[PDB]
RNA sequence: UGAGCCUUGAUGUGUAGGAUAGGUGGGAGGCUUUGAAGUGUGGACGCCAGUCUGCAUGGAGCCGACCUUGAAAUACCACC
RNA sequence: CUUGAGUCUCGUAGAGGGGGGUAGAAUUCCAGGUGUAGCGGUGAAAUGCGUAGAGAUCUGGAGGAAUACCGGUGGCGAAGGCGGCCCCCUGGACGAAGACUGACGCUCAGGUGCGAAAGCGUGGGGAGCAAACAGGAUUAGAUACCCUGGUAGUCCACGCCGUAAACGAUGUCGACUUGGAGGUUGUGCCCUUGAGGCGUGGCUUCCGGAGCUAACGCGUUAAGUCGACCGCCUGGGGAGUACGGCCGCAAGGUUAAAACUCAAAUGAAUUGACGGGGGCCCGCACAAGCGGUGGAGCAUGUGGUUUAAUUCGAUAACGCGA
RNA sequence: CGCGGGGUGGAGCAGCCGGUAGCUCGUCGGGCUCAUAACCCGAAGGUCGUCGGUUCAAAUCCGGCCCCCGCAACCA
RNA sequence: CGCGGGGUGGAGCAGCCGGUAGCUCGUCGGGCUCAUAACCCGAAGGUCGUCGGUUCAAAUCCGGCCCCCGCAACCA
């Protein structure tokens, strides 16, 4: 996330750009994931469970949407 | 001491404590300050406010070097990441580059074990 | 309370000067529903203060108040294992009341003989920026400053 | 890089105060064309009031007991 | 004889296996520069490292291990498992057409092989992590959880071990039975007039019909409808233990009882209750305030003790029946 | 017999100069606690084995005795 | 005996010119805190061993004494 302040650019804007760049990089998240060790099984489990959750969110709620609430 | 116009700010932002270190462009450190050293302990030094005042202190320290331009490198995750640089800005330097300088391995060393809490 | 905020009840201004703040002060001073005495005491003090400092009665009282009003106080959140005091900006209605209560406690504490006289001394001190109420005010500020990291 | 020394320069806030008074003795005027007061500032010290001093400009005066003070002039002086 | 089974031809994708090279990031250490009082850690600390110059920061070097992104209910493999690039050797799978062989097939007790992690042996290696261990915390205690360190091991070579919730808790092979939404990898045709249109094969994720099921659920990848072969079960404990055998360096594995003992033990689902589960909401529940009680003397009730008796009851009881 | 440790609040471990007279658990009260143990506060338990003495400070330094230890030696 | 360090607020470490009279823990108050230690604020404790003197600045420079150190030498 290397950044250079443009000529006649506000500081705050520059900071915002940097924050955006960092977010894009996923650096903080990267760090968080590497703080301590995750067992392979745990990693697998998380990935799978997340996928399951995603699929539920995609399909079951769509089905629910078809019917009106009131 | 020799005056220098342009230099670096290295911001080591940990979870527990922030460390600001101003240096010349070559690598030689001019001054430094810390949240722990700014009189912040435990809960209090792991905060953005602690970090900004540490940054302010560091800025004060390198007054005699008469630095004007500055590029910043931000290391690590912490609260004193945005707050620190804002504080630095306020202290009245021309911020030139903001760089993120976290060490990310490409899956090298095994981290320590997960805490059980 | 949980469910509904309610509008604050109506308060009449005091007969002598026609002011709400003074009436609130006398109310604060009062005890056992004894209003006439408490307001007599308040008046007596006020008269002594006016004599001492010159200015109007009211104006002097207001000045004394100003010197003991807090900008910020602290409250206990304690989300963590140990407790964390967090500063908070105190609102106009509250700050005035706090300063009143603080003056009255000081008056209670003082060593002088008559209640009105003690209150009068307390007001003089506040004007001068000594006393008890100003110290406590300072302590409140100091605590807030210490815990400024939290926001 | 440490550290002596012949020498010639600088350095010294009790409060009374012209204000950054080390002390003794010989003393009432020392310096000024081998260039005096006022101005521009380069580098030092600093108790932020100022002090010494380089170079430029200027060319005919600044400082004395003073009023005060336990001690008087860095008016010249030697001893340290 | 050619449908099953196999061979040949051309392609395809792949973390499939074995060997040998190499790249970059990051950690650790060493040497040196700058620099100055903290660093580190936690819920909060402390142990610990630091003015003998740490932490931070820059330069150079060493070494080990693993390969961010790509990366995906993606791929490959009999399973275990396999992930940076390159090269060498190598196994399988699938598709396209043809050509050939001509039942050569399926299953499999014994038998043989492969078989995570930990563990063992000998020799190497050793950055990080970390059983054991030590100290600091926490605690009533804390031989734990947390912190600071830290050795076996993890890594490599060659042997052994032969077990795991080695799981889809679902043996292998074949046939047949409504559908939808995908992923991946081929391939035929079609104006690819465009990322498309219509098919046809392989593997694969989810939902769901009939049917099945104790229900939960499974549902063309069956737990449906059938056939072939094998393995295994016969109440719970005792016990996957003892003895014996076989294997193993050992750890132990494997095979595998009995006495005795109970009338249960279990599975799915149901209603509640509970949770230091989650969401929403309320109450002088907290918060914000004012005044009390707890200390004093007395009144009064109770407990107790005492008494001849100190009436009996109440114990959301105790100025209560009274 | 001879020689080193010393003799305590229910048990134990008590800061070289003699003026400090203890801490854990324990029992009671109370406060919290759903409970208990925990946590907090406070409370009763001495001789300092003993006899004496140097000294206003003495159990606290010394002379003897009674025991608890430890000693290492002995035994016709 | 001679020679180097100097003698302080309950203990300790106090900025070359004599005008600064301290900081840690400690005790009390309060504020927070569930608790405690921590954190914050404020408060009582001096002689600067002593006797003197140069000087308005003195414990702060010197003459003697009392001790604490350190010295290194000695001992019929």
Swiss-Prot record, chain B:
UniProt keyword list? Methylation, Ribonucleoprotein, Ribosomal protein, RNA-binding, rRNA-binding
Q: Name one GO molecular function term.
A: structural constituent of ribosome
Keyword set includes Ribosomal protein: yes
User: Which cellular components does GO assign to this protein?
Assistant: cytoplasm; cytosol; cytosolic small ribosomal subunit
Q: Which Pfam families match?
A: Ribosomal_S11 (PF00411)
Transmembrane feature ranges: none
Q: Tell me more from the record.
A: Has been predicted to contact the N-terminal domain of IF-3 based on footprint studies; exactly how IF-3 interacts with the 30S subunit is controversial.
Function text = Located on the platform of the 30S subunit, it bridges several disparate RNA helices of the 16S rRNA. Forms part of the Shine-Dalgarno cleft in the 70S ribosome.
The UniProt entry's sequence similarity note says: Belongs to the universal ribosomal protein uS11 family.
Kindly give the NCBIfam families that the UniProt entry links to this protein: PRK05309.1, uS11_bact
Stated name of the protein: Small ribosomal subunit protein uS11
Q: Give the originating organism.
A: Escherichia coli (strain K12)
Give the classification, highest ranks.
Bacteria, Pseudomonadati, Pseudomonadota, Gammaproteobacteria, Enterobacterales
Q: Which gene underlies this protein? A: rpsK
Swiss-Prot record, chain C:
**What are the BP-aspect GO terms?**
cytoplasmic translation; negative regulation of translation; ribosomal small subunit assembly; translation
Molecular function (Gene Ontology), one example: structural constituent of ribosome
Q: What is the effect of changing residue 35 to A/E?
A: Defective in ribosome assembly
Question: Keywords for this entry?
Answer: Ribonucleoprotein, Ribosomal protein, RNA-binding, rRNA-binding, tRNA-binding
Q: List cellular component terms (GO).
A: cytoplasm; cytosol; cytosolic small ribosomal subunit; membrane; ribosome
Looking at the keywords, is DNA repair present? no
Misc: The strain K12 sequence is shown. Has been predicted to contact the N-terminal domain of IF-3 based on footprint studies; exactly how IF-3 interacts with the 30S subunit is controversial.
Q: What family classification does the UniProt entry report for this protein? A: Belongs to the universal ribosomal protein uS7 family.
Q: What does this protein do?
A: One of the primary rRNA binding proteins, it binds directly to 16S rRNA where it nucleates assembly of the head domain of the 30S subunit. Is located at the subunit interface close to the decoding center, where it has been shown to contact mRNA. Has been shown to contact tRNA in both the P and E sites; it probably blocks exit of the E site tRNA.
What interactions and quaternary structure are annotated? Part of the 30S ribosomal subunit. Contacts proteins S9 and S11. Cross-links to IF3 and the P and E site tRNAs.
**Protein's UniProt name:** Small ribosomal subunit protein uS7
- Its gene is rpsG
Give the stretch of the parent protein shown, with its full length.
2 to 152 of 179
